[PDB]
Amino acid sequence: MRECISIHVGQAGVQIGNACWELYCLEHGIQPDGQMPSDKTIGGGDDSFNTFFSETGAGKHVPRAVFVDLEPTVIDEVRTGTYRQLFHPEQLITGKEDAANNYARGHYTIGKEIIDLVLDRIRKLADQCTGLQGFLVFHSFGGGTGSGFTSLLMERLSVDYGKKSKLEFSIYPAPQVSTAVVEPYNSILTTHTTLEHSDCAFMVDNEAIYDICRRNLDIERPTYTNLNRLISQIVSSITASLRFDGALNVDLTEFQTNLVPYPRIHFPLATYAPVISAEKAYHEQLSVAEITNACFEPANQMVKCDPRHGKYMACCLLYRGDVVPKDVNAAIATIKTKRSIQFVDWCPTGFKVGINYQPPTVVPGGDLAKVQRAVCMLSNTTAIAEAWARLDHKFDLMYAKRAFVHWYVGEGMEEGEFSEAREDMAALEKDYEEVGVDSV
């Protein structure tokens, strides 16, 4: 089997998980209360849901999820919502104050009093697992919980499992837009966990998806529901090969093998091509070449950085629906013909292709349009360093005067650790600059 364990930490992670499990239940025809009427109606016995769901004797399907937060508002929302009857009652909360947006509180002071429960539940889930593939961790750099507790949890997981894959889906802070004052500190502090423990971290920011919603979907006032639905679509596209048959499947292990060129360079961008409203669903062919070209536009990138200011070092294109390999080869040849898309000389192969026969699913009441073809592009490129640099500058502007540092050092953090994380980020930026130079 091909199981994957999903973990959601903090408000952003939990709400993204709400969207993700909504999409998954819609995909596999599982009702909110856990029963699947298709098996009773037809008979079933040949479906594929072990990647995310686990059966019981009564026919209920329980997801392989762990919802974690340091305050109970969001998880109490889930406990009394539409999907209250779906999850196991082990949706773990701290019956106390949250991290309150600082790494030190989430990592050292109050995050150590729930980590035992989280690890015990992860162990129990893994014991039911026979073919475990990896961990999909959802969190946010900006928040205290999503940074500190995620760091602690990933450290413990690396100590315990070690050999298993770990994939991150994080909400990086945007260049201009921001909803907190101490975001740079937490984001820089998460550098160590992102580097040493994570195997491949996919980064997102709210500003880029807001721009995508404004331009493509024709949504003038977008809320977090739309962002979560888009991120859920991307995550479903990533894991589609573990659930359905396709011409060229792509599991997580080979995925990382052909995406990650060096151990420290595991920070790819992600994008989804056919983001189009139902009004614009007509007047467009949406052929394979069209969507593949749409993947590489700077505007459609889900991280506010310019790909044209850096050399592509690897690319993986995961197609869903009615797609023929010859069309994909023609599209990739067309992309290689273009001059603006610069590839590093030491990666002549360039692209990886996977194809799946399951078309994308549409959530009812969602604002995405039904399409026959879709493609998700994950690209390892040097552009992301620019994003790090801008956040780097923000950190300096707040650390010269030691602003807000007393809150952090009052919760078990040492003053010297800030500079250490800063130097680690600087080393990472230097490595990303170094790999981009042409060989001699």
Binding site: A104, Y108, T109, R402, V405, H406, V409, G410, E411, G412, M413, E414, E415, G416, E417, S419, E420
Partner: protein, 338 residues
């Protein structure tokens, strides 16, 4: 210009047992005796994987006599001249802070030599001046002052009042007038007995409060006639509790907040020192952020010599602590140069 805050950082010598049990790995490869904290110059230390610049670097062979003669002898001259003087001590656990500041009877520490030379100096100056010495010893704990030499005093008695003539004069503080260094050390031991402490990790006697020793020297004319000119001075010897991370802590509770306060106090002190060294920030210095900085409001300016004895170790068991200590030392004078 010349400034008044000087940084002298010393490297602890290896013990016989640690050297024997840790040099085996170095001998085999060429155990953690890598000599991580080495020296290349009296004012520069690039052997930490990074380059740091310090006012004075005190090597392995440096014994107590040259330590005193280099770090704190001019402070006695300044305090006898009529200007305040201060010496801080900072070092994590196992860094030899106690060995340097106090020492053993075989090897006298900094306090012994400083008191001995002060007593000799006043003995020489007796022929022309009448000089007396007043001693006080107090502890700062959770932003509360406690009299170590006179316990049972309520915390609300000991408060700071800003005297009009640039004096602090913490109220209800017991005062002593020892006449010799021996009884000074007896009083110091009496105070250290009352020092707040608690077992932590495998250590049983980890100090968890800042300690301050104040020596007020009052001088007046003997062989002359004058109306009112004494200009009494103060020498401060400050022992700062080492920083600590909750991660090491497990019991939490009162040990947490205590430790947290210590960190906050250290941070405040650092800012004050930095605010004093940078000429741009001279408009305002955050003295009020902690009890210690308020207590030393007039004992860090340009008209008073301040020094800091930073004690580190070369072992690998304390690599992170030593790096943190070096970074804290660099905070005083962030002369980022190569």
């Amino acid at each position: 210009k010349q400034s008044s805050i000087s940084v002298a950082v010393r490297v602890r010598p290896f013990t016989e047992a640690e050297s024997n049990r840790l040099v085996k790995i170095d001998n085999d490869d060429v155990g953690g005796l890598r000599k991580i904290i080495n020296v290349v110059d009296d004012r520069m230390l690039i052997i930490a994987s990074k380059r740091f610049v310090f006012d004075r670097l005190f090597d392995e062979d440096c014994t107590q006599d040259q330590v005193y003669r280099n770090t704190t002898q001019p402070l006695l001259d300044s305090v006898l001249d009529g200007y305040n003087a201060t010496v801080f001590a900072y070092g994590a656990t196992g860094c030899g802070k106690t060995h340097t500041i106090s020492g053993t009877p075989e090897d006298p520490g900094v306090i012994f030599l400083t008191m001995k030379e002060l007593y000799n100096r006043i003995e020489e100056l007796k022929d022309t001046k009448i000089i007396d010495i007043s001693l006080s010893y107090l502890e700062i704990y959770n932003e509360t002052i406690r009299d170590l030499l006179n316990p049972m005093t309520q915390c609300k008695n000991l408060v700071i009042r800003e005297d009009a003539n640039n004096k602090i004069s913490v109220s209800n503080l017991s005062r002593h007038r020892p006449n010799s260094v021996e009884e000074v050390m007896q009083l110091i031991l009496e105070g250290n007995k009352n020092r707040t402490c608690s077992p932590t990790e495998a250590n049983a006697t980890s100090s968890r409060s800042h300690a301050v020793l104040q020596i007020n020297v009052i001088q007046k004319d003997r062989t002359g006639d004058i109306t009112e000119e004494h200009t009494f001075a103060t020498l401060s010897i400050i022992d700062l509790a080492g920083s600590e991370r909750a991660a090491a802590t497990k019991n939490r509770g009162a040990r947490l907040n205590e430790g947290a306060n210590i960190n906050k106090s250290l941070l405040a002190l650092g800012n004050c020192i930095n605010a004093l060294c940078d000429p741009r920030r001279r408009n305002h210095v955050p003295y009020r952020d902690s009890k210690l900085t308020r207590l030393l409001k007039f004992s860090l300016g340009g008209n008073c010599k301040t020094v800091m004895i930073v004690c580190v170790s070369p072992s690998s068991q304390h690599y992170d602590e030593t790096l943190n200590t070096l970074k804290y030392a660099d905070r005083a004078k962030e002369i980022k140069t190569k």
